[model samples]
Target chain A: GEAGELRIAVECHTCFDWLMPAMGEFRPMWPQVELDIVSGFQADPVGLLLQHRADLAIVSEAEKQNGISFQPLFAYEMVGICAPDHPLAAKNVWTAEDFIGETLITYPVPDEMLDLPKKILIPKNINPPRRHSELTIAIIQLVASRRGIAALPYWTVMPYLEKGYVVHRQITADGLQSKLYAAIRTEDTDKSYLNNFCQIIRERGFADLPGLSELE
Target chain B: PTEGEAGELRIAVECHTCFDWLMPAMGEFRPMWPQVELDIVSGFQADPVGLLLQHRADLAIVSEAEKQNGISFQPLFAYEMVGICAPDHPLAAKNVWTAEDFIGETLITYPVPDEMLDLPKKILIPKNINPPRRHSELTIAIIQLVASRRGIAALPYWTVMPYLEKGYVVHRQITADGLQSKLYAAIRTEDTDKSYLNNFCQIIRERGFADLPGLSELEP
Candidate 1:
């Protein structure tokens, strides 16, 4: 096996929960492979891969780019969350109209990059009031306190639901499905260590993460 | 009129809540000096000043200004850091908190170095009291954790005002004198004389003092 560095760049903060565990599993099997996160605020993680600043990038979209290959990881459902006592909590499913007049708490990213707006709301021509935060815990806390409602991946909010801090509702009748992909330089696609790491992430996520499924 | 004037101000901020006031200040500056392009260096920065040295950022909003060659720090306003906890928590009963009071309690804070945190660096470290710790990147999350009785926190007085008003959390003095911290705009000495850069610094101080609550002038 060729020994090389694995500098991973992640877009989502929630990825850390499962990513770290996969790294721990990788270390014992591949002692020669070095692992580290390309730290700091990365607005363009795939750009880091192209710049040679990062060896791999974990991204949500599989947009085509020159000299880059996208590896399928796993798909997860994004569910709606709110305070236990909130009226929305009683409903089993959330419709786009339910968001009208309701404040949407989300990460401080562009609306175009968000799923709720891009896939669900914009299609229906609905624009709701919004609030922003950079941390996941804060968003959950805000939801629990009835500051606003949020739509996040089911696996990411499982613990909060278990603790009774917040309750979850299905987003739309069919649910909002999101996928994760590992982007690597096209030339390095055949690297054994990279493939092994990707496999580990998929396996670990399915085994440990709730509501995660194989990518179609 | 200053002819052919063009400059780029890449700002890197060390404090999370600084953005609350900074964005508004930037908006005001844009129309006044459209020639000076302004941008915030993206992502959480552990060493914002380091970005200035690397030329990755032209300006850094920071609490501490270490003496370095070719670096100049312009003083901004000072603010007090207060202890926060759940309204019904045991610590809420105290008017002021001593370092010893945090011994068995969990200290919730932003995920930054101790030197960057006032509670651990100023109060707990000097008194040699080490408590269990939890970290979050968002101030709102830290407030929520405090509200849930997960742990106690210390944050700028002004930043926590909305939460305090809503009764989501209660604040108390960190010490008899209270923990005071100051902010500075760190830039290269050569660029200090740039009128546009100086104006940006001025806007921050003026806007921060005018808009933010409980802020004081920096001491000479």
Candidate 2:
């Protein structure tokens, strides 16, 4: 029943597509709760939440910050993608060695921010040549044309996969898994609308997104 | 003779592909005018000319030259936009592409309004061909999509040459006459006489002509 402003900040650009729809669904239900997306490029969205600049921050990794509490959303598979005719497409699964001599196209962020390089490649001491783009479509296009290979969320690339524009393969034997979190200030956890918004994202994400499952 | 010259030339570019040549040109301009601090204004600027007026940017690399008081537009060069498609796509076999050719086909482009896009503004809009659109901010991404037959794109001739050479994609003239656009170095009118600013413009022209293929001088 708490009626106040709810400003959301997203760390990933692809989150906007799904998050916008969730926000649309939330508006009619909570007319008293003002909803807004903190615009402009946000380098530290959780920091904004702590600073009270944003009420909620959609983040991938949940760090143990002093005043921040992360709500578990859902876990999704990150699949390796490439051109249908690419040699890598012939395999059912890809390993760290498969990245050798290949260019890795990714969002223009450091290795620590990406699951592909940070968790997989870096652990094996494998560093492929890199190309960066700020848009998800650009990264997918690059992978589709054989300009490079990339690992992206299954739901994000499902449409392209259906169109035969690109093909997705398992990253490893078990596949690469990543989770999403809704970060908010610890003091604001009692707010009903904020908690409802998180539930809406998790519900909408599972219902609308393929390859999305419960977070263990 | 070059002593006592201390100033900053913060450049803002409207074109995404300008950096390929602009960065190298900036490198060449550095040794000649060591005292002039050369830097590029970060991020995408929708209103680069406004940045110059606000003094946030000292110069702007723009494609259009509109008449404005206290603003000077220096002519750079003209370049053609060639239609790009997958090598085996039907359009690739054509000599030139017309407005009707875009019908029922997706027109991939940068994420900008129709007014800022030349292909839609100059060619498709007049003919009333409102094809589906896909947007990407990277030039290589657009080319890659075009190569995969996801959609067709019209990009600068020089920017597509490397991919064209590799047989990844093929290019055709946008129209029989071709669609050409000009670049200008915009600055505050009062600062037009600054030697370092003028020299930076000169370097863009000289280096662009030498490096970029199919580049032409502005008409006298």
Candidate 3:
């Protein structure tokens, strides 16, 4: 029999928060499983995971380590964010020149910025305020403040852009994707329950990513 | 060996139909195996298998197969039941059920204890502990239970299938744990024929007398 309960660390967003509700439905299909979650800030997710707090950590590709085995679940593009009245809202395309003198904001960072793929230059010396609010409502406030623009995962930014409060443009960002990653500490002993939990996650929770198409 | 032939061996059964099927087939079964005579006595639930552990019976047919100290069950056949009523009843078309389904509905059932109910009603009843009214005999009484459009009762499908053909009651498909009900033959663990159980199970299954109940050996 498997001993020691499963304690997993996950983000509180839609993709990862799904673990709890999904597990409620999944336990009937696999009756032997019981688990506990250790939730933490999305900022520097991997660093907190490496602190030996959880058996598994799920976040984005922003922080991949050679010593940690990273299983990429899927990916999505980064979309631009700004208030509707911003001057660049009329432009259909985006460039590094547009952001050269503006403020840029991001959610609290996970250690090493592992999921952030650098393509467009993040101009120096302009500090965009980091807020706890979500992209849709936050962009409304961001554009109203006129201080800067925020780039968010495309799906997260799409609905607000559709409602006319925020203007979002998709840039040719190379490797700037938020793909899920499951990290396991190399030294942890192999256990069957971890494999079973990963199987359930792969089956039910990876449906919203891009490019892999199979994940869709 | 032949019936009542001198030195013929005898075996007893609880349910009559099992004896009916086994009796006619015994000639073919006894050609060489257990060459002794065969005798079958039916309706021994008075000496049910639980009683057999207490030395009251050698065996009996059980509806549910539960393992107990000094007793075991030899797998057997299935008997089924389902709730029947008109399609227009408020609860009839639901994809699933809620406790409210039984309100203002007439209920009909056999002598089964209330605790055995898979869906214990949440609705409060008056002074009586049992639900308002019930028919305790068996399947035939189930038809009359629903005739007045009050509440309905459940009975074995085969017993009620002819009624459906004659339009007495309509069925509402439902189950306890996502499946149907079934019957099993139970016997004392230490007393049953060890080699005969599996073959007896196969014969009953292959003959379509029943289907596997799909319940667990141990409760979860």
Candidate 4:
């Protein structure tokens, strides 16, 4: 097969786990497609389509009903993770008050990109001291050592749960859930390679994501 | 009046791996000199010496040796650049890799100019060999990509040693002698005599030995 390129721009950091395996498998599945992740984020992610900066964007939510096509890949449950002995770990349901005095550990991105602080904590005026670290492993290490509590996608923290390094509690009784989608320009959605790309994301990408299922 | 206690020391870094060692070393300085505030700017730099000349930064951690006007570079440490890939990757078993081995491989690197990257600039370009490439500001993403066997990357050995210990990626020598480079801390010559600047440099030098072992000091 002749060489081709697939430039990706991702909004969800957790998608690294999914994208890694999928991209690795591209060697066997589509040897022609050389994949690389373009650096930086666009103010409007779909704008990347017009700029031709990214062939695909793994985003948390969909927008701009026409310019880009959002294909649902998986829906993940976001849970509060903490040291096994932490009080909040045993709580069936937690409120904004539960986090008021505790430190909120999170990814280094803006608080608005985080569902826990943005959708749940901020609405009721609960603002706790926050610490930001970039890597998921770093975040897990901090939470497991009781440095602070964090709200992370279950898929990202599941291994730690299995190893007894940390424990996860539902963010709320109803639970916090978020969907991930692959946003591609509608102009390229019908291309055969794009369909194959989506199929790999749905199949291999979701294989190991604990507490997540096909968006359907 | 010269800046002193309660003054800010602005630092710019050209080498991407410096932070892994530098940040931890800075922790020791905070308690010793709480009066001084640190303003650190880090990432790939096309020209770190230019930053010092422009007065855009007070100090710069750089990889290349320089003797430009008004700037004095102090030798830091020398490190070897090693090839990295998934542990069982085919290339991992090689005693050494040639430029041609990288032809089809996706070369992952920090977002730096092509001339600054040793693998592509010193090795591949000289041999007229080119490979597909990827760039990112985050080192861990580079690690994740290599760990997944997606492609290969080259970084300072110390920078990827922890991942090697974890068996995420295997490190290989790029050539028989290994590609080595010396790091330097460049400062405006006028600032070299400043007490605070000298103290920080001493601390960096001392910590490089106490905290980070196995790294060789540059011969005076």
> How much is B9 displaced in model 1, in angstroms?
0.3
For candidate 4, the docking band is incorrect
Looking at model 1 chain A, report the run of 10 residues with the lowest lDDT sum. A33-42
Q: Find the 10 residues in a row with the least total lDDT in model 2 chain B.
A: B36-45
Residues A1-216 of candidate 4: C-alpha lDDT, one tens digit per residue = 265567777755677767765765554566566566764552445667668888887777786577688888888888888877778877877776789999998866776677888788889898899876555665665565566899888777777777665788888767888888888888887767777877887878566666667785
Interface RMSD for candidate 4 relative to the native interface: 7.5
In order of DockQ, best first, we have 4, 1, 2, 3
Greater-TM-score candidate between 2 and 3: 2
Clashes of each: 1, 0, 12, 0
lDDT, candidate 3, A82-173, per-residue tens: 66667877766656566655666654343234222244453323233343322233334444344467666666665555555567775543
Query: Which tens-of-lDDT digit does each residue in B92-190 have in candidate 3?
Result: 676443334555566765444453343332122322334464533324334533532446665445555656665546765444333244456555666
lDDT for position B58 in model 3: 44
**Deviation of model 4 at A173, angstroms:** 2.7
Q: Which candidate number has the best TM-score? A: 4
Please tell me how candidate 2 rates in CAPRI terms. Answer: incorrect
Error of 4 at B181 (Å): 11
Candidate 2 residue pairs in backbone clash: none
TM-score of 4: 0.60
**What DockQ number belongs to candidate 2?**
0.04
The segments of candidate 2 whose C-alpha lies over 4 angstroms from its true place after superposition are A1-216, B1-4, B42-45
